Scaffold this active site. Structure first.
Site, short mmCIF file in Angstrom:
data_model
loop_
_atom_site.label_atom_id
_atom_site.label_comp_id
_atom_site.label_asym_id
_atom_site.label_seq_id
_atom_site.Cartn_x
_atom_site.Cartn_y
_atom_site.Cartn_z
N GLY A 239 -1.57 3.54 0.65
CA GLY A 239 -0.98 4.63 1.39
C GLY A 239 -1.01 4.42 2.87
N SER B 104 -5.44 -1.57 -1.35
CA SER B 104 -5.09 -1.35 0.02
C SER B 104 -5.95 -0.30 0.64
CB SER B 104 -3.68 -0.92 0.10
OG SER B 104 -3.25 -0.95 1.39
N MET B 105 -5.35 0.77 1.10
CA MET B 105 -6.16 1.81 1.69
C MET B 105 -7.09 2.40 0.66
SD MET B 105 -6.75 2.94 4.49
CE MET B 105 -7.69 4.05 5.41
N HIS C 44 -5.68 -6.11 1.55
CA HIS C 44 -4.67 -6.81 2.33
C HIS C 44 -4.44 -6.19 3.70
CE1 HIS C 44 -1.37 -3.89 2.15
NE2 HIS C 44 -1.78 -3.61 0.92
N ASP D 262 -2.52 -10.54 -0.01
CA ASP D 262 -3.14 -9.74 -1.02
C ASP D 262 -4.12 -10.50 -1.83
OD1 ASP D 262 -1.03 -8.70 -0.11
OD2 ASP D 262 -0.21 -8.00 -1.92
#
Lengths: 192, 192, 192, 192, 192, 192, 192, 192, 192, 192
Positions: D68, D97-98, D122, D171
């Site tokens: 996000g 991610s977040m 990432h 990633d």
């Protein structure tokens, strides 16, 4: 919270009604926006409901409407004429087309428009695609409606039929004082 | 939870109310966003509702609006001049076009504007497609509205009509101090 | 279930409330997402509501917003200045553009942000299509707004006006420690 | 009926609570789907609410999220660090991610991950269109954010900064056992 | 608040019912808009509900409808004939196509239309794309329906079958008095 | 004829060439509309073609262009600076961005501008979406291009580099007389 | 084909030119539709081509155009002043906006309109979106264009500048005889 | 062959032309489809071309057109009166609105209509959106066009002006014999 | 190469033409697709062209068409009757509506139909949207066309008028032998 | 160069033809893609053209087609039977539906199919929307065609009619050897 709630005291005072319901209780119905079938089925339900609540008291119908479907407007038109209490129609904003038609249909002597309102009248619109045979049928159908619409306007306004017929060929705008002179309404409400 | 609930103590103290309903209870009505028919109808319903609750107390109308449909705005305009209690209008954010029109229509001496708000005035917009004959009718109709709108501005602001006529030719923006000097509002609210 | 209910025991019962209403009772208002008219209109309603509840207590405004409409933001801006209690603004996530503008507008000494937040400031955006004459009018108005925003930034931050003038020509990003040095906030909250 | 109700006996009665509220009551907060401003804003409200109810007891954050907006996520990140009780994060489904970022941000020793969950890390994404000058400004800001995120990963995972810098270039997927070895989580829950 | 609430007194007085439910309580059912499956499904449920409430009390069906799906409409048609109490159908606005079909299906002597209603009748519409073999199957299927509808119209109106077939070849509009002469309805309601 | 044919006498006189080819024979090339790759490839082809026909004679380039993509623009730029004969550029209509750049690139002393023509200059635009690492790479490249473009402007106009950098920060419009003193062009053409 | 070929006798008679090329051969440049860059390139190319063919003989430009891009029109405007042959301009159908501007720009004494041709003039349109700094720049430029356009019509029509500014404030329509008195054109062509 | 080639014998007989060009040599111009600027400009070019070829010989214009832009039609209208040879118009298929106007504009005594062709006349259509001041400007102009158009038909048809106005308020269809009686055309062609 | 070229020898043998032009030389016109204005305009041009080439020799019209717009087809219809040489129409593929109408319009005794070709006839389609007054005008016109079309088929087929009206009530399909018996065509072609 | 040119020598040898025109010279016609009316007419034109060139010599029709409109295809079907020279048909790629229908329609003994090609036969598709009465007409219409197509294949293949009807109820796919045994084609071509 699009429509605010209001509280009214009674005995216990346990009453919370959306403002629309609260005003229905005061015998006020609002007719606004395009006249269509679902909306002009709620106006009818409300008028039948108020008639039963107290057949001897006026119903105030606030009109602010650009027009709409003649058929839908006629269920309103007939309900107003059928039920017992007078329906007093008040024009605010505008009463155009079918909206003007219903405005003049209120009880005689009780039809009125706020002073900066606008009433607009004009022959009905419609259309139809298909075979030439069907076109004739539908064309005949809209002309009968036009004729019927003209008779009722003349009835409620006091204009001769010949005159009402001429005046609706093209959109005719009337200011509140003009609506009074013409006979669409009886008076102008100014101040309470 | 787009609109939070608030709780208020009374005698039983059980009532909760959408914050907007809580404010309606204090005779505060908010006019925001575009002026259209459904919105206007709701504002009119709120004003009629408050008039009935207590005809002797002022109604506060908070305005933050870019403008909108004149016809719809006129139903607010006329209700405000009809109902018995004074309507005190307050401009916050902006009062443009029809929004400015309604702002100046508040009770004299009670038209207020927060200091960083903007008020914008301008002749009415509109348009029409059709036969040259219909174009003329509709053109005549918008000019009458313009003229009528100019007359009401002069009435409420104290400006001569000729001055209003010139000043609305093109969009005119007024800062809160300019609105006061011009006569659109009586004063600026600053701090409690 | 988008917004979970919480319960609190006080006098005679639980009173469940949308977590957002539970926090409104603590005098906490959240401002998130774009600043627009409806959102802003609701924040003002909340501030007026809290001011009445207890004029002597601070209101906490949590800001996490990318920016928005200036007019809508000024509605918020003026209410914060008008109402009696201090509004303490807290920046979390981001306060960009108009969001930053409102962040600095909180009561002095009570403006603060979380350690990893970002504050971004820039001159106002806008535009217009039309005749050169109208373009001239609208361009002039946006410049007056820019000037007005520049003065309010200087007032609240302590920066000279020229320094603000230079700093906002192009987007400027400030980390929480820079917001403190710049004067947009008074401090950084870290741990309880 | 999207979300069922559950009923639990308390003291003097029993209460029906949306299952999502029933779990908030147990200090369980669910973070799912994309991290954005409105959802993040709600999680923050829930954490502040739980912190007040019992500052001395842990809060459990269940994460099943693809990632996000960083800004929105940082407001969650900062609240978790600010509030007094430990926030124990549990990764189920995915934390990418977040989402991964918030997962490692939980209280040390209390970061848990289910056996078949995947964690992905990432460098931040973004972009900008405009003049070379504005591009330059925005490019620097994203790089500062990247650096800042790298610093927080290293802090929470125990990895050197150089190692974090390399591992987020592209990633990098980690299985639950890999998350443990890497230091994103402390342990894997298996069976009760 | 699209549909207003009405309050009715009883013993204790605690009755707040959506206006349409208030009318269902009086044995009034409204059929408006297109005839489809969900609508029809609800009307059937309401009629069965009223039949059970009091098997010896007419049910009033208010029709304002342009037509719709025959299949859906036939479930209303069959329920009306199946249930014990008479169903009295009232045409307001319009009863076209399937709407007209249901209007004439009401109890003999109890079918009526307000003075300005329009009733329109016409052979079934339909269509189908596919292989000539499938076209043949579907074409026979629609012709059987047409034949079946023709028989029921003749049964209810008293027209011979040959006459009813000729009259539905093309759209045929009937005014309220024409519907009475034709036999679609028994009478016209005028005033209370 | 979207593009008219013209004829001319040579030897036998059987020469009928599109008007655009007729002018190519006079060593006139038009550069109009935006500068992209295909239009650039054609201008380059025309220049190489004219250079071969007579390396000692001037080529006239008519510019009427709102902009371009730069890269395409550089193939034109480099061709003009490679081929032996002077390329004399004439600005008609407008030369903006890439058009202005190429206009100033004409042979010194031969850069002309029609009197009501307008010239506009501004730093390059661009943008990029992706990982922070890629954003950096792409930001780094646009800035190099900007710098390279600034050096060439200064080289061709005679302005210092610092002055060029300041003047391209924001769109700068120059009237034909301004272009002359600025040094974008050498003179204004008036009448034959 | 959509444009007829015509045969003309010369020497051998082997000439079959598209009708538009045939007319170019008579020094007739047909300008039509909106003025843009590509259509301007052809009018200009034709103007340069005819000037070369016979510098002493008049060029006839037929105008039937609703307007267009000011810039593109200026390249035409200037070409006409630069080249030696008088350019005679004929207005047929309409010359509006930029089209009217070019009409009046023809050689004095040679500007004329067919009897039912209409000419319309009005200040330039434009617009811009961006930062307040950029808005100012662009507003500043359109006003310079307006001023420049006002000077040129005053020059060509003989009206004072003050009068042109007043008249082009809003669209001013002129019948062909009105264009003659005003000075936009010198005469009305009637019959051969 | 979108348009087939035809061969004529001459001297050598080496002439091949798209049937459209072949008929142009016989002084036949077709006007079909709607009238717009480009098709008008092409007809005018053909008329000017034929006038030059032989000023004393008639031009035949075949009309099969539903109408179009008045302005464009006026370019045709005026060319037809200006040039020396008579333009004989022939109506085939239909001529309506602008088509009807133009066929009546043909040389007196030479306006012909095929027997099953239809001619339709009506007042001009148009419209406009903008400020009430602009609406007023545009409405006056369309009315002037209407007035001008009625004068020209009265001139060409021999009807009084009042009669033309009465007959164009709403669409009037005329069969070929009706067009003759009315005076739109002089006679009906029957057979060779 | 959508349309092949063919060659033929005459004098020197230097003749190459689009197969469609090769067929005009054999006096064959091919009318396909739907009859609209542009394709009708081209057929008329071809008929006029062939009539001029040899007024005494027959023209063959191959019809393969699903229908048309009538007006366009009437221009073909009238040309066929006007020009001196007989037009022999041949129906292959299909001739529906306007196709069939034109098929019967061929010279008596020369109307042929290939054996598996079908012919379909029906009353004209059309429609209108607008005011009831205009609906009446347009309905009146389509019925006149229907009537006119019925008269012409009775003329060409030998059927009574009453019979044509009955038959074209709904789509009537005829196989090639049925078309012969009915009288739409004179005979079926079999083999050379 | 979508379609290449080929060079061939004759007498003078100055012949260059689009490869498809080169193949008409060898009496080869290709039928590819969907059968519609425009290509069908082009095929018919080619067949008529070749028949005229040499009535005694075969025409080769190459078929590679998924099917198409029956009506359009029947014009090819009939031309093939009408013209004197045998039309030999070759199936390459596929011959489906109408493509198969035409493949079998070739001259007996001359219907060939390449070895890896596929032939598909199946009953007609179609459909119709409208009144039950029109549905009945159109349904009969497609069944007559189905019957007619079935008869023609039985004629050309030698299968009994009853067998053809069974085999076309569902798509029937035949490999080239199956087409030979079935009788759709006479033989398979292998190598020169």
């Amino acid at each position: 919270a699009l429509v605010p709630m209001v509280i009214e005291q009674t005995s216990r005072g346990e009453r919370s009604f959306d403002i629309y319901s609260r005003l229905l209780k005061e015998r006020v119905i609002f007719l606004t926006g395009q006249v269509e079938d679902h909306m002009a089925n709620l106006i009818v339900a409300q008028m039948l409901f108020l008639e039963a609540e107290n057949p001897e008291k006026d119903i105030y119908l606030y009109i602010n409407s650009p027009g709409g479907v003649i058929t839908a407007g006629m269920s309103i038109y007939d309900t107003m004429q059928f039920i017992k209490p007078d329906v007093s129609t008040i024009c605010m904003g505008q009463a155009a087309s079918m909206g003007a038609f219903l405005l003049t249909a209120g009880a005689k002597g009780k039809r009125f428009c706020l002073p900066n309102s606008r009433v607009m009248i004009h022959q009905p619109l419609g259309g139809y695609q298909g075979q030439a045979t069907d076109i004739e049928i539908h064309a005949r159908e809209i002309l009968k409606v036009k004729g019927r619409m003209n008779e009722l306007m003349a009835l409620h306004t006091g204009q001769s039929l010949e005159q009402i017929e001429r005046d609706t060929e093209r959109d005719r705008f009337l200011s509140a004082p003009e609506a009074v002179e013409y006979g669409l309404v009886d008076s102008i409400l100014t101040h309470r």
